Design a protein around this ligand. Structure first.
Ligand SMILES: CC(=O)SCC[N+](C)(C)C
Length: 287
C-alpha cells in the first residue's frame, strides 16, 4: 500500500551533474574560455539544446514544472560527488563538484536563512565512474562507490547543518546500458559500481534523515529505467541503445524521431526520457 504524498514544493535547489545541468557548464566554460583557462572547451557543445546535455529539459526541470516549483539549478556537467569535475582543467577556476556547488550555495545566501520549505535535489555520481574508467583510477570500484556514497551523505549533512530540511536524492542511473560503457566493454564494471552505490546510499540517507529530522525521498532511477526499457512501446520508445546524436568518434547527423530514442548522445538520455524521469520523481509529492 502507498503512503501519504509529501507536502507540495514551491522552490527546488538542484545539485548534480550533466543529468540535471540547465546551463551552468555552458555559462562557466564561456567564462573560462574568456579568461584563457588552460585546456578549457565549450561545453556541452553545438549538438545540444540550450546548454543542456540533451535535446531538451533535464529531469529536474520537468520535476519543477510538475510540482509548480521555481528551480535554482546549480548542477554542472561533469560534476563529481566531491569537490571537482570530470574536466580536471575546471579546478583552476571553480570547484564544480557537488561539494563545491554546496559551498557556493551556502556562501551566496547574502544574510538570508536557508529556505526550510525548499526541496534540495541531489543527483550525482556518474562522473565519478566515467572519470575512474576514462583516466585509469586505481581505487577498486567498491572503494570508489564508498567514496561516492560518503560524499553524497556529507553533502546532505552540510546542507542540513545550514538549515535545509527537505531532500530528494537520486540513485545511480543504470550506467551499465550507457552506450559509451557498452562501447568500452565496461558493462560488468558499471553493474558492480552502481549496485554498490544503490545498496549503501539509501541506508546512509535513512540514518541521517532520522537523526536530523529531515524529509528525505529516495528516487530509484535504476528501477525507473528497467521498467521503461522492458516495456518501451508503452512509452513510445523504439531505440534503446543507439544514440540519436552520435558524437564518437565524430559528430554525425541526428536521427529524425528523437522522442522514440532513449539516448541522445553516448552518455545522456533524450528529452523524452528526462520527461518520464521528472514525472516519476514528481509522483511522491502533492501538487
Ligand atoms: C554525468 C556527467 O556529468 S558526464 C558528462 C559526460 N562526460 C562523462 C563525458 C563528462
Amino acid at each position: 500500500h502507498t503512503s501519504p504524498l509529501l507536502a507540495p514544493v514551491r522552490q527546488i535547489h538542484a545539485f548534480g551533474d550533466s543529468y540535471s545541468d540547465n546551463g551552468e557548464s555552458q555559462r562557466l566554460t564561456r567564462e573560462m574560455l574568456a579568461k584563457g583557462i588552460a585546456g578549457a572547451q565549450a561545453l556541452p557543445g553545438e549538438v545540444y539544446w540550450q546548454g543542456r546535455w540533451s535535446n531538451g529539459p533535464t529531469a529536474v526541470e520537468v520535476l519543477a514544472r510538475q510540482l509548480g516549483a521555481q528551480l535554482a539549478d546549480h548542477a554542472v556537467g561533469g560534476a563529481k560527488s566531491g569537490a571537482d569535475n570530470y574536466y580536471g582543467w575546471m579546478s583552476a577556476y571553480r570547484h564544480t563538484g557537488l561539494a563545491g556547488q554546496v559551498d557556493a550555495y551556502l556562501a551566496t545566501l547574502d544574510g538570508k536563512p536557508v529556505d526550510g520549505q525548499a526541496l534540495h535535489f541531489i543527483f550525482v555520481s556518474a562522473a565519478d565512474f566515467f572519470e575512474h574508467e576514462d583516466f585509469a583510477g586505481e581505487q577498486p570500484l567498491e572503494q570508489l562507490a564508498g567514496s561516492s556514497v560518503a560524499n553524497i551523505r556529507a553533502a546532505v549533512q552540510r546542507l542540513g547543518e545550514a538549515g535545509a530540511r527537505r531532500f530528494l536524492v537520486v540513485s545511480s542511473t543504470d550506467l551499465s546500458v550507457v552506450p559509451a560503457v557498452v562501447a568500452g566493454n565496461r558493462v560488468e564494471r558499471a553493474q558492480r559500481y552502481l549496485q554498490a552505490v544503490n545498496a549503501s546510499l539509501p541506508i546512509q540517507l535513512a540514518a541521517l534523515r532520522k537523526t536530523r529530522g529531515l524529509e528525505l525521498s529516495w528516487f530509484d532511477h535504476l528501477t525507473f529505467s528497467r521498467h521503461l526499457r522492458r516495456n518501451p512501446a508503452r512509452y513510445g520508445l523504439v531505440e534503446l541503445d543507439a544514440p540519436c546524436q552520435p558524437t564518437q568518434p565524430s559528430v554525425r547527423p541526428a536521427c529524425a524521431n528523437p522522442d522514440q530514442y532513449y539516448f541522445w548522445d553516448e552518455w545522456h538520455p533524450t528529452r523524452r526520457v528526462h520527461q518520464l524521469a521528472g514525472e516519476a520523481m514528481a509522483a511522491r509529492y502533492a501538487r
